UniProtKB/Swiss-Prot annotation, chain B:
Biotechnology annotation for this entry: Co-administration of salinamide and rifampicin or salinamide and myxopyronin suppresses the emergence of resistance to both antibiotics.
Post-translation changes: Acetylated on several lysine residues in the presence of glucose.
Function, in words: DNA-dependent RNA polymerase (RNAP) catalyzes the transcription of DNA into RNA using the four ribonucleoside triphosphates as substrates. Resistance to the antibiotics salinamide A, salinamide B, rifampicin, streptolydigin, CBR703, myxopyronin, and lipiarmycin can result from mutations in this protein.
Listed name of the protein: DNA-directed RNA polymerase subunit beta'
Quaternary structure and interacting proteins, as annotated: The RNAP catalytic core consists of 2 alpha, 1 beta, 1 beta' and 1 omega subunit. When a sigma factor is associated with the core the holoenzyme is formed, which can initiate transcription. The rRNA transcription and antitermination complex (rrnTAC) consists of RNAP, NusA, NusB, NusE (rpsJ), NusG, SubB, ribosomal protein S4, DNA and precursor rRNA; S4 is more flexible than other subunits.
Source organism, top-level taxon: Bacteria
Similarity remark: Belongs to the RNA polymerase beta' chain family.
Curated annotation (Swiss-Prot), chain C:
Gene: rpoB
Family: Belongs to the RNA polymerase beta chain family.
Annotated source species: Escherichia coli (strain K12)
Function recorded in the entry: DNA-dependent RNA polymerase (RNAP) catalyzes the transcription of DNA into RNA using the four ribonucleoside triphosphates as substrates. Resistance to the antibiotics salinamide A, salinamide B, rifampicin, streptolydigin, CBR703, myxopyronin, and lipiarmycin can result from mutations in this protein.
Protein name in the entry: DNA-directed RNA polymerase subunit beta
Residues of the full protein shown: 697 to 796 of 1342
Quaternary structure and partners: The RNAP catalytic core consists of 2 alpha, 1 beta, 1 beta' and 1 omega subunit. When a sigma factor is associated with the core the holoenzyme is formed, which can initiate transcription. The rRNA transcription and antitermination complex (rrnTAC) consists of RNAP, NusA, NusB, NusE (rpsJ), NusG, SubB, ribosomal protein S4, DNA and precursor rRNA; S4 is more flexible than other subunits. In pull-down experiments interacts with CedA.
From Swiss-Prot, chain F:
This protein's UniProt keywords: Acetylation, ADP-ribosylation, DNA-directed RNA polymerase, Nucleotidyltransferase, Transcription, Transferase
Record PTM: (Microbial infection) ADP-ribosylated on both alpha subunits by the phage T4 protein ModA. ADP-ribosylated on only one of the alpha subunits by the phage T4 protein Alt.
One GO BP annotation of this record: DNA-templated transcription initiation
Protein name per UniProt: DNA-directed RNA polymerase subunit alpha
Organism whose genome encodes this protein: Escherichia coli (strain K12)
Protein encoded by which gene: rpoA
Function: DNA-dependent RNA polymerase (RNAP) catalyzes the transcription of DNA into RNA using the four ribonucleoside triphosphates as substrates. This subunit plays an important role in subunit assembly since its dimerization is the first step in the sequential assembly of subunits to form the holoenzyme.
Taxonomy of the source species: Bacteria, Pseudomonadati, Pseudomonadota, Gammaproteobacteria, Enterobacterales
Length: 219, 49, 100, 50, 49, 218
């Protein structure tokens, strides 16, 4: 005599924030289900992040470049927060060629159709000289979790973060006009970087929870 | 979830009137010392008490 | 930067020799991570052999306590600056304050 | 003046809000003092002492 | 577990343990679930959790 | 790698008694010991189908606070003894049982008549004590099939119902070590029941209960 929850509302107010609503939920199941979904969402979710940056002329990260206002370390910290989404590939190499006075954004990347930049307003660096030019090779691979670089000369390694979500907040409230009174409603408000679908994240979290609970089912 | 705050350390409501009576007693002892009835050491001891 | 400060952080950041304080005011001509070029105005220019100011920033090097001291620029191209304003932020310095 | 600055925003005047547990998920019984403190890292690291 | 200087124990609990055991073993005159008969400590732990 | 997680391969059970068990799973991912320990703890303590005594009817007792002749203790101790009586009831919704005894001696659970398809898991469990030879006790208990715990203040002597077949559950997360990875967990489940079902069967029932709620997604 248990009612299974369904996806009755997937609200998308912005590209980063979204709302997921689970209407049929009994008393007591909503809190533990929201807590388990929040733990799986904040624990392990697959994503794509920058791992290796190779710039022509730059030898190590503790140096500068003639014409760039920022240092190499500031360029790597700006490239660490680059939100990117790969459709069906594991590893891809991005190319960024820019010359002249002007800010260098994510829209100046000569990329193919399999990869997509979700935020072209991300400023990488600034060029202050007309004779200055940059040509970097951004290596992006798919992972899970937080893998630092501590685990060629011009090759620079950065700490990759495969965490597409940033903040998960759920809320349990009383149900609707449905005649059974003790039903509860779970509303999950997630904050991502725009590279993950919310419904696909909920399906993956429930699949991870079911594949972890299968050992308790078998016993 | 125990925590400290600025509202946990309460102030007694009768602190200001006790300070007022103490300052009035110090002023009365100083006025008695200015007339020449008590010495300086007895005045200091009464102020301390 | 500290959200709860005092106001003496700018005195520590200016009176110490960790920042690049502009000697003569003017307009910033060339901004770079290693050097800052300042175009001095005609009000403070010398009557003989008028020139510009070049500030070579102190990059990554070793201090006495085996730490890294580094100066990062804080000005932009074509920005008016005055005499006494900072041009580069040294170690533990954020826009002319003390950021420990 | 801190009370007026807290009334300027959407924050309570007492400075204490209720928090939920991350491991279990239940609310704490008492509100805790949540805010921002300027922290510092001293030159007494553990890799230079082991 | 006993000090050889005087015989007093040295495994006395510190501030967090005595704070938790002081907050747990207290009572108020009106709370949720006051005035009900319990069959054991397991029912008390079940009603608390 | 990107979608593969570690499964618990070292499962050992320590049977302390017939109702006390100790299940230990090893290894698990970092943080998976609490999202699986707390989720099964909230289900087994609040959502479990079972049967318990709900109402009792005694002709000699008309109030909740009164005294009765011929018995040793008061009525609240009789209600507390009736609270701990675990009864196994078949697919019927509810039945009415009666208890009659005349004479001295402890009134155990075996004195209740077998009218119906119900079972008593502990016939040696006592209910009340009689001291006079010319005294008798006549009660009409009423069991019902419910779920979880409902107090008497939420709802004729009011008796608290314990539909959950468990009595105490407390998980503990330890550290597990692999030759490659270190940040792992070790879930230790310690659970006791009242003798109605197997604790392993209770863990399996909680696992299938949590598994039925996710079939719309998986």
């Amino acid at each position: 005599e248990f009612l299974k929850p369904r996806l009755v509302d997937i609200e998308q107010v912005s590209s980063t924030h979204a709302k997921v609503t689970l209407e049929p939920l009994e008393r007591g199941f909503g809190h533990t289900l929201g807590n388990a979904l929040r733990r799986i969402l904040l624990s392990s979710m697959p994503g794509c992040a920058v791992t290796e940056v190779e710039i022509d002329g730059v030898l190590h990260e503790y140096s500068t470049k003639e014409g760039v206002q920022e240092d190499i370390l500031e360029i790597l910290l700006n490239l660490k927060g680059l939100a990117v989404r790969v459709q069906g590939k594991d590893e891809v190499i991005l190319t960024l060629n820019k010359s002249g006075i002007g800010p260098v954004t994510a829209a100046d990347i000569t990329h193919d159709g399999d990869v997509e930049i979700v935020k072209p307003q991300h400023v990488i660096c600034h060029l202050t000289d007309e004779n200055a030019s940059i040509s970097m090779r951004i290596k992006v691979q798919r992972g899970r979790g937080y893998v630092p670089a501590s685990t060629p000369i011009g090759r620079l390694l950065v700490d990759a973060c495969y965490s597409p979500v940033e903040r998960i907040a759920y809320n349990v409230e009383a149900a609707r006009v449905e005649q059974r009174t003790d039903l509860d409603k779970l509303v999950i408000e997630m904050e991502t970087n725009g590279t993950i679908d919310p419904e696909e994240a909920i399906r993956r979290a429930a699949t991870i929870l079911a594949e972890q609970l299968e050992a308790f089912v078998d016993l | 979830g125990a925590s400290v705050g600025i509202d946990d350390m309460v102030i007694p409501e009768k602190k200001h009137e006790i300070i007022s009576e103490a300052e009035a007693e110090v002023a009365e002892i100083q006025e008695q010392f200015q007339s020449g009835l008590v010495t300086a050491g007895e005045r200091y001891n009464k102020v301390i008490d | 930067k500290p959200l709860v400060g005092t106001g003496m952080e700018r005195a520590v950041a200016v009176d110490s020799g960790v920042t690049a304080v502009a000697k003569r005011g003017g307009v910033v001509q060339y901004v770079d991570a290693s050097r800052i070029v300042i175009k001095v105005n005609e009000d403070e220019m010398y009557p003989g052999e008028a020139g510009i100011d070049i500030y070579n920033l102190t990059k990554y090097t070793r201090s006495n306590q085996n730490t890294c001291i580094n100066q990062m620029p804080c000005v932009s191209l074509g920005e008016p600056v005055e005499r006494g304003d900072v041009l580069a932020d040294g170690p533990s310095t954020d826009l002319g304050e003390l950021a420990l | 003046e801190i009370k007026e600055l807290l009334k300027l925003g959407d924050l309570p005047t007492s400075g204490q809000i209720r928090l939920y547990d991350g491991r279990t998920g239940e609310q704490f019984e008492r509100p805790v003092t949540v805010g921002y403190m300027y922290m510092l890292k001293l030159n007494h690291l553990v890799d230079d002492k082991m | 577990i006993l000090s050889p200087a005087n015989g007093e124990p040295i495994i006395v609990p510190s501030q967090d343990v005595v704070l938790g055991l002081y907050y747990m073993t207290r009572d108020c005159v009106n709370a949720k679930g006051e005035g009900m008969v319990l069959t054991g400590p397991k029912e008390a732990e079940r009603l608390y959790r």
